[PDB]
Symmetry: C3
Subunit: 310 residues, 3 copies
């Protein structure tokens, strides 16, 4: 049933996983199927059998424990072997990739240079998974985000999604807008005017018939119609004047006074790490899904690794 679904055909098999723009609605539907199966297999036996004999190497030039350990644990729970590497940007990336390709069957790469995906494509002779390229894309983060929504709420039809915070530099938002192109959702965008979406991402939303509201304020009416409250970090450097920055924090902080205006079923998401824009007092609330996000990311990356490495 799982050996079945992994028998199926996919763009993932033997492929680099560098951008969400490589994958179709069907690609992701199959992936999410396999991720449900992965969750069942693990719930019963802990470490499965899919990838005995396969070696994954993780190559992180900047540390991101959530992502690197997620891939480590996914590979090992597939029954594969992992080689975790920590380094910093003097040997070039293309030399390191070609070095490590001789040891492993695939590499997860996170690197401060967004052109790293291009280097990986030109030089690396094994599949590379893009674990973050200068903060431009992080495709499995987009995957696990979409999956989180599906899993927590059921069908995508009818949903209203509210992105809050820094939507200019918040690329996980942009990647997720792309993945939502296939769905009859409405979207609200709460941000200062200085940090609205890039005009082309906004244009992606109006083109799909999805842009509902744009607002600088996180209001009880916006909150009352939110099925999904996807928050982003808002860093002080994005503002010239500190006063502005704190005004915007206090406005956007998800705490109990903010959740009271929400729905009983509102899913609160966050790619993490967070500063104070989601209060700790909310972590135990059923609607707080940002730790369940990471267990969903476990099952999605098991599926992705199974598909890429057969």
């Amino acid at each position: 049933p799982l050996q079945e679904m992994l028998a199926a055909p996919s763009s993932f098999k033997k492929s680099h996983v560098l951008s969400v723009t490589q994958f179709t609605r069907a690609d992701l539907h199959l992936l999410f199927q396999i991720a449900q199966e992965m969750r069942l297999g693990v719930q019963r036996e802990g470490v499965l059998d899919i990838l005995r004999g396969k070696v994954l190497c993780t190559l992180f030039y900047e540390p991101s424990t959530r992502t690197s350990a997620s891939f480590d644990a996914a590979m090992q729970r597939l029954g594969g072997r992992t080689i975790p590497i920590q380094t910093s940007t003097g040997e070039t990336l293309q030399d390191t990739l070609r070095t490590l390709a001789n040891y492993s069957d695939a590499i997860v790469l996170r690197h401060p240079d967004e052109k790293c995906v291009d280097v990986a494509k030109k030089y690396c002779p094994v599949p590379v998974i893009n674990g973050g390229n200068g903060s431009k894309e992080h495709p499995t983060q987009a995957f696990l985000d979409l999956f989180t929504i599906r899993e927590e709420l059921g069908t995508m039809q009818g949903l209203t999604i509210t992105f809050v915070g820094d939507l200019l530099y918040g690329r996980p938002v942009h990647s997720l807008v792309y993945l939502l192109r296939h769905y009859q959702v409405k979207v609200q965008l709460v941000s200062p005017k200085a940090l609205r979406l890039p005009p082309a991402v906004r244009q992606q939303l109006v083109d799909a018939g999805q842009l509902l509201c744009e607002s600088e304020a996180l209001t009880p009416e916006i909150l009352g119609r939110t099925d999904v409250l996807y928050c982003t970090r808002v860093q002080k450097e994005r503002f010239p004047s500190l006063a502005e920055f704190e005004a915007v924090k206090d406005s956007y902080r998800i705490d109990y006074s903010t959740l009271k205006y929400a729905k009983p079923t509102t899913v609160v998401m966050h790619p993490l790490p967070r500063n104070e824009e989601v209060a700790e007092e909310v972590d135990f609330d059923q609607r707080a899904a940002y730790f369940r996000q990471m267990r969903y990311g476990l099952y999605c990356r098991m599926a992705l690794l199974a598909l890429v490495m057969s």
Copy 2:
């Protein structure tokens, strides 16, 4: 026989392991039984079968190779999988614990903040083993210490234990006094007056009918009645005047001129690392047990991991 003893009931199963004050004489007797079995299993097959399908994550905010690699090797020799994380104290500990709990079935945590155990108790949804909380407790170090004594000398009745060095800041001593509450031992305490035991730990000893001698000098008579010479590091910062500090080093240094006054059967212990308070010239001496300590700690942590994770 081992599947038998792991069938048995214990406070360890599914529990946080944060303090020695959580465990009874029976708890530790069972643990030591299982540790003897672990040593046999490993002596014959290297990597056992107990914890296939289980994932342990080690989370060390300060490096301690002896402890982190001991737990890595214990888990893997149980047939489980390990995810070793190195980080430093900006994401909070409770967020990191909840992140990693989605990947592993338990976490070993070492952290500079002694309140970390409380954080782990409030937030973490998988068992946490306390690998050292701001140097206040290190329970498996206490376990392997008691086990070391048992293993090297047989029965605890009749023993004289001599703690030497810095007994104020030497908490492994305090934890071990607690674990020795059950035993008819006598204890000698050699330290400067500035670094005697905390009055309550001393009071724990007189209450048990165990305090034999307190001395600022490491004397041939104290040495002649020592079954166990447990040394601690003496750091220069614990003294205002350098002269005092070196006087105390030279007095307490375990070398050949000091061992000659000891028994042929005196077990010399040290939690490690050491500076010069145990001379290298003594390392090959049969009585030098501070490297055998760590192989005993291997078997004890295999037992503890087997019990906690079933």
Copy 3:
């Protein structure tokens, strides 16, 4: 057939691997046999069975991803378990070795002090593999180098080997000269006069009837008779005057204008890392063997680990 060849007798079994001067022509012939078998086993099943139940610990005091990950991947592909340690030169090496010997069945050690091999011999109770001792020796690098030549060109009789660059501080060259003592090869040595071989290594070559040419220039005639072009890094510190250093770079740089004077079958080798002394424009050329080197090193280290740990 592999269980056969590992049944055979070898100086490797249970031995420290510290110097090329420990091993005979037969030792290396057997090793290369087993490495061919390792390549076949892995090509069909990924992770083999040879060393289930064995634990290897890697202990690198300076990072060298190519070497540490090569040994990690070799052990794991033998079916053993690995414990990778990263540290820096306050606990002594002999204390760390004795600590870790209680957890693993062998240790790969790389350390800035060339005397580390002596420390390892005096104190460590498990086999130690020398992964680099203050840049004096790196024996498995020599092994994989010789194997690379054999594999790419067939029989050693008739070959001309040309070492280029910094032959004084290039010890992999010296180790490889030693390993070539058994073979009817000719050797050319291209280097500035300031960086010729040590007189005793040169004397090793004339004693074997092998020194063909010594030159400060990399000439079309030297290139035309090169079967193996083994390049070394040339670092700016080896020259007082920058002008000299760049003159020597430009002279020695392997690029297309330099390869045109070579043979169609010239194997270009490099221990790596490289600066600019092999141009990127050459990496895709069939003759560029410095990434295949590392896959050969994978199979050689699998063989060496299998032999040392039975």
